[PDB]
Amino acid sequence: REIPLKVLVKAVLFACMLMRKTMASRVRVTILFATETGKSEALAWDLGALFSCAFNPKVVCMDKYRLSCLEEERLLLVVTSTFGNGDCPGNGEKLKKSLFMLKELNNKFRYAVFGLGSSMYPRFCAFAHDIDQKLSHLGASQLTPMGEGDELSGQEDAFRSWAVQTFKAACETFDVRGKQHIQIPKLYT
Amino acid sequence: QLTEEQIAEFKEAFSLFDKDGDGTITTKELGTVMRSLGQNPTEAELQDMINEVDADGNGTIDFPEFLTMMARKMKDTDSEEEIREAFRVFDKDGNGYISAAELRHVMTNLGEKLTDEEVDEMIREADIDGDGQVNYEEFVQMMTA
Ligand SMILES: Cc1cc2nc3c(=O)[nH]c(=O)nc-3n(C[C@H](O)[C@H](O)[C@H](O)COP(=O)(O)O)c2cc1C
Ligand SMILES: [Ca+2]
Ligand SMILES: [Ca+2]
Ligand SMILES: [Ca+2]
Ligand SMILES: [Ca+2]
Description:
The complex is a heterodimer. Chain A folds into two domains: about 25 residues, Single alpha-helices involved in coiled-coils or other helix-helix interfaces (Helix non-globular), CATH 6.10.250; about 160 residues, Flavodoxin domain (Rossmann fold). Chain A has five helices and six strands. By secondary structure, chain A is of the alpha/beta class. Chain A is globular and about 65 Å long. In chain A, helix 2 packs parallel to helix 5. In chain B, helix 2 crosses helix 3. Chain B has two domains: about 70 residues, no CATH class; about 60 residues, no CATH class. Chain B is globular, with a radius of gyration of 16 Å. Chains A and B meet through helix 1 of A and helix 1, helix 2, helix 3, helix 4 and helix 5 of B. The complex binds flavin mononucleotide and calcium ion (4 copies). Flavin mononucleotide (FMN) binds next to helix 2 and strand 4 of chain A. Chain B: It comes from Homo sapiens (Human). Chain B: It is found in: Cytoplasm, Cytoskeleton, Spindle; Cytoplasm, Cytoskeleton, Spindle pole; Cytoplasm, Cytoskeleton, Microtubule organizing center, Centrosome; Cell projection, Cilium, Flagellum. Chain B: This is Calmodulin-1. Chain B: Belongs to the calmodulin family.
């Protein structure tokens, strides 16, 4: 018993050389998040974990996202909370200004949205609804309906619920081989 | 390039995948190790990988197909990134250092539970600056000998 490090290392290099290739051949997915208290970013990186089971997801803060990209996306996923009165989180105003200025979109990509909110306020998940309504108008096809995780009534539960359903749908419109047999995380049961 | 030493290491590396010892690596034996390493390819992707290295199109990978590939991919530039992706598999915290535990973790995940001793040596097996750890520089120097 045992494997010399120099050997193991060559073996893991073998696996990595293979994952790299199947990964670059998968479909890219962009996950955008905006957040004040960090709950959206956590859910956003959770969405990435789930999407890593069939796609090439990337988690990116709304303020580091260059709109030019909208013209090349295959599937855009958005996870953001709301503040003030239908206001976006801090790191979301930059993209907010843009997305609402934007009058046209040639690449009618696919998108799904999920926003964090709190029933207490009259404008519930208003920012998430704002970007969601705006994207349909621009032409993109709503993969799955917008979800809403109520800070008061089981946010995660709702998230996970939407995370999984939005994923089974993505594996469908994108023709994912072995669709119904993909082993996803344990939290999404 | 390619010295009997390197070839022989690639054979033992090959063996790590060919657990049952029949001389071929199956789409099943591949998934097992990749998932052990925290890689999550789908069944259809597993066959892709098997199909890519499978030169005789006979359904599985023998050492020769394995050697054929590794020898080529090694002398290349992509190794840069790939070798580095190989580091991350070990360096879970991405702190730039492969600590003893991390090495333990991967091994236990590979179904290889070792005493804390043989693990600390499995490190000094490439620890240039004797800090009981493997950095990137020492890791890349260990892959390219
Ligand atoms: C001052 C303040 C104003 C808020 N306004 C709204 C609002 O108008 N609509 C809503 O749905 N949620 C509202 N919330 C709740 C956040 O959306 C919710 O706390 C969320 O969990 C924080 O998410 P984050 O961690 O991703 O930023 C508000 C919270 C605070 C502290
Ligand atoms: Ca075998
Ligand atoms: Ca073969
Ligand atoms: Ca580390
Ligand atoms: Ca060292």
